[PDB]
Structure formats: C-alpha cells, structure tokens
Amino acid sequence: FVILDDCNEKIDTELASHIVDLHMKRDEAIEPPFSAEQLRRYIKYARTFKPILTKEARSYLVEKYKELRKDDASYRITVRQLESMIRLSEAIARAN
Amino acid sequence: KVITDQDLAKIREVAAREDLYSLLARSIAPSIYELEDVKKGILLQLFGGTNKTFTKGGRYRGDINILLCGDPSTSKSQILQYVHKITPRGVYTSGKGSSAVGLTAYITLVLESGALVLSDGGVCCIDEFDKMSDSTRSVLHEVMEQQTISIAKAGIITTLNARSSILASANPIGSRYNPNLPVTENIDLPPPLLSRFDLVYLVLDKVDEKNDRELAKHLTNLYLEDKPEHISQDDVLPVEFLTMYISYAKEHIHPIITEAAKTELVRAYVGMRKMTATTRQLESMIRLAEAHAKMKLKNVVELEDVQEAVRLIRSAIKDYATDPKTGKIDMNLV
Ligand SMILES: Nc1ncnc2c1ncn2[C@@H]1O[C@H](COP(=O)(O)OP(=O)(O)NP(=O)(O)O)[C@@H](O)[C@H]1O
Ligand SMILES: [Mg+2]
C-alpha cells in the first residue's frame, strides 16, 4: 500500500474538522459500528470456518490471472500472485 | 530536594497584568539582548500543551519540540544554558558527545537509562545537532512522534515512556547562511525529521549600525563593575517566583477547545494549506494555542490564543520575507 498526500481543499476541510473534533471531544468523535469486545468474538467465530473453492470460481480465477499477466506483459507478476489471490479469497469468504 | 494564600494572591495578581506575556518572556534569560520571538517560543515550550488519553484511539502528546538554526555567534548556545538551569528535570548534551545507545537506553543481564529517559517530563537540550550522524539522528523519529522507546535485543524486549521535550541548536550547511539557496536546502535536515519540530527558527547575523551600537553598549556595560549588578531591563521577575508561577500553572490549569477556536483553526489550516503545510501543522497549532491559554490561567482556548499560535509560526521561519515561488529569502526585508 502506497500513501500520498494528494492535497485537495474538499478533503482538507473535512480532515481538519475530524482532527479538531478528536482534540475537542475525547471518546465521542469515533462512534464505531461495533464494540471491540464484540468484534473480537466475531473474529474468533469466523476463524472456525474452512471454506472450499467452487467450480465456477476455479474457471474464473484463470481468466483473472491471464488478465494480470497481460497487464504485466512495476514488479513482474509471477505464479505467487495467483496463490496470494486464493489466500485473499479464502479470507473474504471466512469474513462472511 | 535542591502553597500559602500569599503565594496564590501574588500569582493571581501578577496574572492580571497587561504586559504579562512580554514580562514572562524577557525574564527567562535576563542578560540576553532582544531575540524576543525566540524567548516567547521557549516560554510556551516550558508551559506545554495538555496531555490527552482516550478509551480507544490512543494518547496525544502535550510536549513541544523546537529547533534553533542560523549563523554563528548569534548566542544560541547561551540560551540553551538558561533553559537547562530553569527546568526542574532535564539534560544538556552535544552532537559529537552522543551515541544511539547513550541517548536512549543501554544493555548491561540488566537494562540502563540514557539521556532521553533521564529527561522524562523535562526538556532535553541538544547542541551541535548538525554534527551527529544520520544513524544517531534516526533514533529520534520514534521518540519524538510517539514519546515511547521500543527495544528488542538478546534477552530483553520491552517499551518505555519518554515524555521528553527537545530543544535543538544547529548551523546551516556551509556554516553561514547562504541566501542563494532555498531555506530547506540551507537547513539540510531530511523531511521526515524536519516535519517533527513544532517551531523552526531562522536567526541571522545581519549588519546594521543601529543594532550594533545597542549591542556594543550592552556587552561593554558588563565590564564597568567587578561583579555586575547591571541587567538588561528595569522590571523582571525573580527566578524563584517565575518557577512557582510556571509550576502551579502546569498542575492546576487544563484548557479546552471552544467552538470559536475550532472554526478559526480549520480556517487557518485551510489558508496555509491552499497554495507546504502538512497535517502536523494543525496539531502543533492546537498545542501552541493550549500552551498560550495556560500562561494566562484560563480554562478555555479562545480566538486570541489561536491567532497568537498562528502568528508565532509565521514569524519563526521568516515567511513574510520568503519568495513564495522560489523559496529564497530577500535579505533586504529582514
Ligand atoms: N544578543 C546577544 N545577547 C547577549 N550576548 C550575545 C548576543 N549576541 C551575541 N552574544 C555573545 O556572543 C557569544 C555567542 O556565543 P554562542 O552562545 O556560542 O553563540 P552561538 O549562536 O551558539 N554561536 P555558535 O556556537 O558559533 O553557533 C557569547 O559571548 C554571547 O554572550
Ligand atoms: Mg555556540
């Protein structure tokens, strides 16, 4: 992941407000979707799943990998990117 | 170690004076001639911001870091002496005198403390900052940003607290300020480290007969007596009472942001940003405004405090005299 400043008034005006709110109110600003002790229980539950790759997904993966190889034809895209993509898909299915 | 209602009466009465800000600033280092903005910035470092801790989302530093940069003979190191003696806790050190281990912590199986750890809650004065190597200076990134020291070596792995304020002194590349280079190239610190200072000062050895006669009369007056009674100004506070004021204000006063101050801070940040100002310029402005509020024994940050914080930042780095496009300074405007 590469992070860059990308200066823009419409973003700066909001980001400054967010930062000043954090210094103005301690706890109140964030309002997260879930409690931390709720989220950890969910993550513990999710890690019990061991999902299996569907037939259509196997057909689809090689097409997407061919697209990456043609984009590649910047770090050069190897077989390892397919293995990594499988790992990410396993994690996504587990999240759900 | 080396309260009464009368003390509180004196403190409250002094805090009501109109010339308070100038009185306090010119009284931290009485025998040093002019350099008022430098003295003001150092005073606000002494007071500090407010410390903040959340239930989640972390903790935010109250401490201010300052860098003094400019020509030789300008009396930078003399100012570091005063700060080193005023502060209750702190250390003075030199660039060629310091190793990475000595500055933080030492394996000896037992762990041992370095300068930034001994200086916790105080001010750490570093002189000849431009002489120490990139290897040694890289240690300061983590301690300045987080105020913690993480260690992971054979048989010991831990994290330590370092609520330490840095006051630094350096001379530019080429050893005298060169007006044919932009300011960032004269200062020559890398951007990840230069971004971590709240205030950066340029001080310049500009020739002027008006200035020179006053300076010469001031320094020669010290030799008219064996042990001088002479002092630069008629009204200054004794060191003991000044210490009492600063200490009490640090303990009892805790300012908060007002909505008006929030609006001005957002406006001012967008003004400096739209044109380079980073996100740290916002947080340092908040911290300076809080330090200004404590110094008046107020419980709230107001519009006046925000505007003083902005003004001092613009004044320190000679921005008004800076060419906005080329980054060089017109020496005629100084
Ligand atoms: N405004 C001033 N007020 C008082 N003394 C001054 C002033 N300007 C210069 N001096 C004197 O000039 C000398 C400055 O020495 P010093 O404090 O080392 O300056 P410096 O900024 O650290 N220069 P350098 O170490 O070469 O980078 C001391 O003797 C001071 O007393
Ligand atoms: Mg010196």
Curated annotation (Swiss-Prot), chain A:
Disulfide bonds: none annotated. It is found in: Nucleus. The modification Phosphothreonine is found at residue 54. Acts as a component of the MCM2-7 complex (MCM complex) which is the putative replicative helicase essential for 'once per cell cycle' DNA replication initiation and elongation in eukaryotic cells. The active ATPase sites in the MCM2-7 ring are formed through the interaction surfaces of two neighboring subunits such that a critical structure of a conserved arginine finger motif is provided in trans relative to the ATP-binding site of the Walker A box of the adjacent subunit. The six ATPase active sites, however, are likely to contribute differentially to the complex helicase activity. Present with 13400 molecules/cell in log phase SD medium. Component of the MCM2-7 complex. The complex forms a toroidal hexameric ring with the proposed subunit order MCM2-MCM6-MCM4-MCM7-MCM3-MCM5; loaded onto DNA, forms a head-head double hexamer. Interacts with MCM10. Belongs to the MCM family. This is DNA replication licensing factor MCM6. It comes from Saccharomyces cerevisiae (strain ATCC 204508 / S288c). The chain holds residues 713 to 814 of 1017 of the full protein.
Swiss-Prot record, chain B:
Residues 20-220 form the MCM domain. It is found in: Nucleus. A motif (Arginine finger) lies at residues 195-198. Belongs to the MCM family. ATP binds at residues 70-77. It comes from the Eukaryota. Component of the MCM2-7 complex. The complex forms a toroidal hexameric ring with the proposed subunit order MCM2-MCM6-MCM4-MCM7-MCM3-MCM5; loaded onto DNA, forms a head-head double hexamer. Changing residue 76 to A: Loss of MCM2-7 complex helicase activity. Acts as a component of the MCM2-7 complex (MCM complex) which is the putative replicative helicase essential for 'once per cell cycle' DNA replication initiation and elongation in eukaryotic cells. The active ATPase sites in the MCM2-7 ring are formed through the interaction surfaces of two neighboring subunits such that a critical structure of a conserved arginine finger motif is provided in trans relative to the ATP-binding site of the Walker A box of the adjacent subunit. The six ATPase active sites, however, are likely to contribute differentially to the complex helicase activity. Present with 8800 molecules/cell in log phase SD medium. Early fractionation of eukaryotic MCM proteins yielded a variety of dimeric, trimeric and tetrameric complexes with unclear biological significance. Specifically a MCM467 subcomplex is shown to have in vitro helicase activity which is inhibited by the MCM2 subunit. The MCM2-7 hexamer is the proposed physiological active complex. The gene is MCM4. This is DNA replication licensing factor MCM4.
